[PDB]
Design a protein around this nucleic acid. Sequence first.
DNA 1: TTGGGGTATGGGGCTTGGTGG
DNA 2: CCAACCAAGCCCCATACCCCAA
Length: 190
Amino acid sequence: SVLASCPKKPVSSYLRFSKEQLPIFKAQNPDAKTTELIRRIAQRWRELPDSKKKIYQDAYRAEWQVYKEEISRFKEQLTPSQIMSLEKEIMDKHLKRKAMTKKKELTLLGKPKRPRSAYNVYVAERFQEAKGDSPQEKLKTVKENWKNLSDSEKELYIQHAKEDETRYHNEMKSWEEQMIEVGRKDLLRR
DNA sequence: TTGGGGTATGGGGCTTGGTGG
DNA sequence: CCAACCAAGCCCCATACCCCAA
């Protein structure tokens, strides 16, 4: 917003080199994947004489000195609550990434999904047949019926809840053993 | 020791509304 | 706190590499 205007850190010499080289390379090699071209460019980097590298190096060092000056000038023109909301935007960012990363890894270790509630299993069935525009509305409809149902009409759902509760228990046990075997006691409950 | 950040894109998943480890 | 139930078009991202600031 105002922090979106925060000066960015310069990227390093290999990154510069690559950024410039990609374009040249893709133009000489239309039928190729980026990943490949990148591998190719990295090799070029390795190959490049130190005296040449040193050129990009100096570019980066001087570009860092600009960042130094830039960031501090930036901070002065900000209020203290601003200075803080900045630092928080950074932390929040980093934590979201950490979050995403652990969530990917669990899914890739096929970690059992949590027990679905009495209400969950109802929604998973009475959503196709539901009035409304967005999902917001298609939901309030199913919500209204939830209040309007009674004990007898909630059996085969609360039954499947109680079943899924035992599915969870079993699946969680298979998975936690699996994990112990794979050297990861750390992903265990408690 | 770690990880972010440059690209481009092919598969990934976070979002908006009101019951459960 | 965060995950679960229903969308799907945008948020993000690992991938190929290297390097240096935190």
